[PDB]
Amino acid sequence: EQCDLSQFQTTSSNQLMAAIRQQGASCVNALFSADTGVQEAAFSSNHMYNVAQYTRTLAQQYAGGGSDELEALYLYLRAGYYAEFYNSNITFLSWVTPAVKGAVDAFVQNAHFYDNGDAHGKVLNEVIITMDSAGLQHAYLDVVTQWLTRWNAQYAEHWYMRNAVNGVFTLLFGGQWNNQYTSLIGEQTALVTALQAFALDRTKVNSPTEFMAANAARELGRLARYTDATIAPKVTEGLTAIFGQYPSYGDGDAIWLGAADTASYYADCSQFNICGFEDALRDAALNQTFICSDTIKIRSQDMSQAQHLAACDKMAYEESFFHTTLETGNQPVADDHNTQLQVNIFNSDTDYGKYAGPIFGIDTNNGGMYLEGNPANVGNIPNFIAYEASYANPDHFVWNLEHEYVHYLDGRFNMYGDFGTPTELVVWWSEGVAEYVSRVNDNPQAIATIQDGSTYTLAQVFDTTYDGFDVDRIYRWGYLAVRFMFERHPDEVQRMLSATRQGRWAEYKAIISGWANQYQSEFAQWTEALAKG
């Protein structure tokens, strides 16, 4: 009825398996992040060996139709490899993995391994993933080649099958760190053939399985690093077919770009005559143009006129609001000619993740990005990149439109030099001022993070970095610190800005470290008031 995580904290392998088969896969989930007393008990090397041997003989008895118990057993096992990797108190002995390989082999060798079906796919998913969690990528290239070859439109009807068989591409990815795999991958001509045919199947384009077509292309592009291996011609031949059959922009461009991403990195674009595809891609994808003013230009994939106007008018509103809140006098920092901004807006986060990478050379694991360029360079035009979203602000519906735009303003009027210039951490200020100016006092998550019991001090906020991308610490606590300082110490803010507007990062760090000593009392009190009313 309910998950009893304590039942897994035992020395009895029998009782551990009773907990797995009774509590089911949804409760085994808790073992991934359980207290290390739970993990150390539940993932002893004996436990893994005994659970593996019972899993193996149970899987020999499998008769199709899915299996809640095998689903939970392979989940438990791969949860162990997760626990071994992240918990230092857990090391598996030499004889654990060959038992796990025996359990996995029993499912692979069973007559029902290539069955179609939702329930069967749910257990198959755990098996495919365990092949990866457990460092066995070198042992099952034959299964990858088989799934690529058998996959058809009937298997594709089932979410869980798509989800399970998509795992073989993660197996090819993870084998990079497996020496038996790298010592072996170079002779797998059957696999390369199958990756090619799978990717090149046009019926996948605009289907629910187009992402699998794209993952096949991406992992084939990885194989182009093995420049002298026996597969090199068929990898190359197959990548050239992908590049020739699908467009760089349009229906199926996910497959073209998947291959281009990895083949460009691990090889050379000139091997495939795709060098410099990024320019034509930029024109095709951001094919609209809309001039707000002589200082702001939008390039967009697909916006209505009503959106363009709303975005232009919203940026003009935020501009004058920025300059009075920051007391700039409309005077830029020295050596900054960034008078003109270019705004680049894709139709969705999906498109952004496909196109902004190759076009602007950024990482897209985020909600937008600002690129200052070199402000001292005459003619430099900075860019920010964003995407439309239904949760974005009307009437423009561009996610983070005002956030990224405050980055442009902040970089030109508060922060001397280009983006890398500072020699001290400014993450809290850049993201804080961008959140505070665009949202003012409307930030329910920043309020939320005060009430949940976990808070940060001023000292801790100021030393925040982008490492790990702690969105809560970066943007919400960046927001609170900037807001607090503006409400209760706008004099002090101008002194800090006097340093950053001139690039005195040592004096700036000196200023804010003072704040973190004195005002910690004020701040702690001031944030509790926000949690009150």
């Binding site: 991934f32 949860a79 997760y82 990797f85 969690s133 993660t170």
Partner: peptide, 6 residues
């Protein structure tokens, strides 16, 4: 590292 939970 190893794949997280589903």
């Amino acid at each position: 590292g190893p794949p997280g939970p589903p």
